[PDB]
Ligand binder design. Structure first.
Ligand SMILES: O=C(CNc1ccc(F)cc1)N[C@@H](C(=O)NO)c1ccc(Br)cc1
Ligand SMILES: [Zn+2]
Length: 888
């Protein structure tokens, strides 16, 4: 069954009240549910059809009269159909009692057991796995929820709303009743039961001075890892108050970590539930990346309280309205908290590698898709991250003052209601009219960002008249036709620009955002005293392919002297890309023609000089420095090469890295040594509330330089690697494992770091990732060793993803020409699909570029995908995903 956006129609039914009794027992959970329902104005006498997946019916009733299977209803394990003639014409009560089995629910959707915690996940379609419902987000209802369980095993009981009763039950059990009067969609329902330990705090809101109790929960073993999450929650609350003027509306907010989770976290109202790897950290037992991850995921789920929970979705095709907008709010928050330029750069780096790949793949879709089979397949980097860039462009176009005015219009007008992408565009249009001082101004063209798939390409030509002091930027935009639009239309593209004087590095014009609304336009600037170098798409102001048409000399000047971090990073990126494409084609030709000798174009010496200049600048940023010594990501590069031969690309990267290191290794080594004191400072190692993002960026730089020096076999660098392995910081000692891959000490450090990791669940997963992405010639034997000794039969998604996904980024080995790496991941996908279709589809990620590779590897990947598709037991999720990916 294919659902189409244009087919939306309101239900013929209304569910006003849900009264749940969830009785948890060792071998089963009994769910009783009374739904106080009505007939809506759209009803036309149809059957009453409920969603209900995998439920064991004990009984169902209408108005306390038990219904008879076969004559009055059918149930096919997916839909409960009550025939029209037995459906009442006015207000009525539907009731049911079903049995479900959280303990064997390894798909982690619906109600399931994670270690010793019972927990739910209802977005998008999981509530129907708990009880019968019209399981779609426009069915808003009140919830009164009672949970009972063995008290010894499950002392802590949580659901949405206020706890209004706690009571004892004979036989060692107990119950708690939660009443949540405000309307909500069923995907925001949640329940948690377990032997949970907590940290707590009281937050007083900014304007109404309301006292909000904050609780963060985990299993007892890891309760000492909760402190940063609680601090991040306070920060998120303050940011929504300070930037958006928005306070929390409930008396309490609970965050709960669980070990088994399909994604990062979930915004259930007042009861946010997290993958443990996105809530728990300590400085002894977590890598640095955990701190930014917890900050952004806590922030993300908090910002949903307005953008998703208070203003909700009419239908799932509007997903980007809450996810793109919440990622945008998340990104603003992160940028303000970290105060590092690499925060924005890391978002752009993600979009232009992963999301651009998706947008040029057969899976390409607009941020508001037109159809789906499994809605879980459209929680994508397109909907989330391109969605966020589309939400960010409103702020770029409007400026902070009018953006905040438009955002508040959207909140005030839609608070407590469902909404669509048009409602948001409407609110921004009102601010646009105010800003332009023109009630005729509109953003109708802006809506194409929601409906048009594919990445626009923006290219430039320039003219400077020295006598007239007149400078022109000619701009073109183009989107390649794809399967979603045969004809692509020009978008509203905001181009943040500066003009740099190449003689002194100074700004030449005030802040300027060009509004490109046609296929092409010419923007002219008068009184430009000298020929400038244009600084284009500052802040990465639109999600596009930038073709700057600048010389490498011009790009070097921007890299050294521009004020905008993104344009400097992009100029570096563009210099690298020109070099990569040139050397790639030289290696390819020598391979194709079987040349006994040939030449390679060297790396630009003035570019290497500029890198050295930046690295040696003690006032320059360490995080930015780590980006400039790193080549662009493989998944960024592959968007620019047809029939990419992964071995030739590996040879290209190796040549270019060797070229630069042959000049700069002594600089790299000197910096690695001089950065030690500040990077590894232990002053606050035992203060979990003290997080220094610049210090972590200095560690990133040290660990990047160490990797470069180790690959280069720099003299006696093994000494530094061994010393690095004794650092108290996991980012450092796990780096010592991966860079030791090039030395005879690798398995010594393998065993040392395993011993350091094995007694913390999350640290062990970081160790698994480090092994998985180790640059080892024997990586296939090493993966078998992880399988046999550590991973075993685990159904934990964090374990499976840790063992296999980093390995898939091994350009030389995963893409082994035998196809053995494709075969290995396909076996893992098919095995995983038997119990967790969502994670099976996540493990398909390496196949997304299949039609971008050389002909032999295309065929090898296609064969494994077609083998996967022929599996008799394949899930709907995996089948739909592979059918779309293979154009079948
Ligand atoms: O957690 C994420 C993204 N991060 C992530 C991390 C590791 C992974 F393996 C996968 C995803 N998204 C949340 C979300 O949006 N919460 O607000 C979400 C919620 C429900 C559904 Br259905 C899908 C996605
Ligand atoms: Zn979200």
């Amino acid at each position: 069954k294919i659902h189409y956006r244009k087919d939306y129609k309101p239900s013929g039914f209304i569910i006003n009240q849900v009264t749940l009794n969830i009785n948890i027992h060792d071998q089963e959970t009994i769910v009783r549910s009374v739904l106080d329902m009505d007939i809506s104005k759209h009803n036309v006498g149809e059957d009453l059809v409920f969603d209900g997946v995998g439920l064991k019916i004990n009984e169902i009733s209408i108005n306390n009269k038990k219904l008879v299977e076969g004559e009055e209803y059918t149930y096919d394990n997916e839909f409960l159909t009550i025939f029209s003639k037995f459906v009442p014409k006015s207000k009525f009560a539907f009731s049911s009692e079903v049995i479900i089995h959280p303990e064997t629910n390894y798909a982690l959707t619906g109600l399931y057991k994670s270690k010793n915690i019972i927990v739910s996940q209802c977005e998008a379609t999981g509530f129907r796995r708990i009880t019968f419902f019209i399981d779609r987000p426009d069915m808003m209802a009140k919830y009164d929820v009672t949970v009972t369980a063995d008290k010894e095993k499950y002392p802590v009981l949580l659901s949405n709303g206020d706890k209004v009763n706690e009571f004892e039950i004979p036989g060692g059990r107990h119950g708690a009743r939660f009443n949540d009067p405000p309307l909500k969609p069923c995907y925001l329902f949640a329940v948690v039961a377990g032997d949970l330990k907590h940290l707590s705090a009281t937050y007083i809101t900014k304007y109404t001075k309301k006292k909000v109790e904050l609780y963060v929960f985990s299993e007892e073993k890891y309760v000492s890892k909760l402190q940063w999450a609680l601090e991040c929650l306070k920060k998120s609350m303050a940011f929504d108050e300070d930037y958006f003027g928005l306070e929390y509306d409930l008396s309490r907010l609970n965050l709960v970590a669980v070990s088994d989770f399909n994604v990062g976290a979930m915004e259930n109202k007042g009861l946010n539930i997290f993958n443990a790897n996105s809530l728990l950290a300590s400085k002894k037992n977590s890598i640095d990346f955990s701190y930014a991850r917890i900050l952004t995921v806590v922030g993300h789920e908090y910002f949903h309280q307005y953008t998703g929970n208070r203003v909700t979705l009419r239908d799932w095709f509007q997903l980007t309205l809450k996810e793109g907008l919440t990622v945008h709010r998340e990104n603003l928050f992160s940028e303000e908290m970290t105060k590092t330029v690499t925060t924005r750069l890391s978002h752009v780096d993600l979009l232009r590698s992963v999301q651009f790949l998706e947008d040029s793949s057969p899976l390409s879709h607009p941020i508001r898709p037109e159809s789906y089979v499994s809605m879980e397949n459209f929680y994508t980097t397109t909907v989330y991250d391109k969605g966020s860039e589309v939400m960010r462009m409103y702020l770029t176009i409007l400026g902070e003052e009018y953006y905040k005015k438009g955002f508040d219009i959207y909140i005030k007008k839609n608070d407590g209601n469902t909404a669509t992408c048009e409602d948001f565009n409407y609110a921004m249009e009102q601010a646009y009219k105010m800003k332009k001082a023109d009630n005729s101004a509109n953003l109708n063209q802006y809506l194409l960002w929601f409906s048009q798939s594919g990445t626009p390409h923006v290219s430039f030509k320039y003219n400077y008249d020295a006598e007239k002091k007149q400078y022109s930027i000619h701009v073109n935009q183009y989107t390649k036709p794809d399967e979603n639009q045969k004809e692509k239309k020009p978008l509203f593209i905001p181009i943040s620009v500066g003009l740099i004087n190449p003689e002194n590095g100074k700004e030449m014009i005030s802040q300027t955002t060009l509004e490109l609304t046609k296929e092409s336009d010419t923007f002219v600037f008068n009184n430009i005293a000298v020929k400038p170098i244009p600084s284009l798409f500052r802040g990465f102001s639109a999600p596009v392919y930038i073709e700057d048409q600048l010389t490498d000399e011009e790009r070097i000047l921007l890299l050294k002297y521009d004020s905008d971090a993104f344009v400097r990073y992009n100029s570096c990126t563009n210099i690298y890309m020109k070099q990569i494409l040139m050397n790639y084609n030289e290696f390819l030709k020598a391979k194709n023609e079987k040349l006994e000798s040939f030449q390679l174009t060297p790396v630009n010496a003035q570019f290497i000089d500029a890198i050295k200049y930046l690295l040696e600048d003690p006032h320059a940023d360490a995080g930015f420095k780590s980006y400039i010594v790193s080549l662009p990501q493989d998944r960024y590069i592959i968007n620019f090469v047809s029939n990419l031969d992964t071995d030739v690309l590996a040879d290209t990267k190796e040549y270019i890295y060797k070229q630069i290191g042959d000049k700069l290794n002594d600089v790299y080594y000197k910096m690695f040594k001089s950065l030690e004191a500040k990077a590894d400072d232990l002053t606050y190692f035992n203060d979990e509330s003290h997080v220094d993002f610049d210090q972590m960026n200095m560690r990133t730089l040290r660990n990047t330089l160490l990797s470069l020096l180790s690959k280069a076999q720099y003299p006696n660098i093994l000494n530094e690697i061994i010393e690095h392995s004794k650092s108290p910081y996991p980012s450092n000692w796990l780096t010592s494992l991966s860079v030791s891959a090039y030395f005879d000490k690798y398995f010594e450090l393998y065993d040392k770091t395993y011993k350091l990791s094995k007694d913390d669940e999350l640290l062990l997963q970081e160790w698994l990732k480090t092994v998985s992405r180790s640059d080892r010639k024997d990586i296939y034997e090493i993966l078998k060793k992880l399988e046999n000794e550590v991973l075993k039969d685990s159904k934990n998604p964090n374990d499976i993803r840790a063992v296999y996904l980093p390995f898939t980024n091994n350009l030389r080995r995963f893409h082994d020409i035998s196809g053995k790496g494709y075969k290995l991941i396909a076996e893992v996908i098919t095995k995983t699909d038997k119990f967790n279709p969502m994670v099976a589809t996540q493990l398909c990620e390496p196949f997304k570029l299949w039609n971008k590779l050389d002909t032999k590897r295309q065929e090898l990947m296609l064969n494994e995908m077609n083998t996967m598709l022929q599996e008799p037991q394949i899930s709907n999720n995996l089948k739909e995903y592979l059918l779309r990916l293979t154009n079948k």
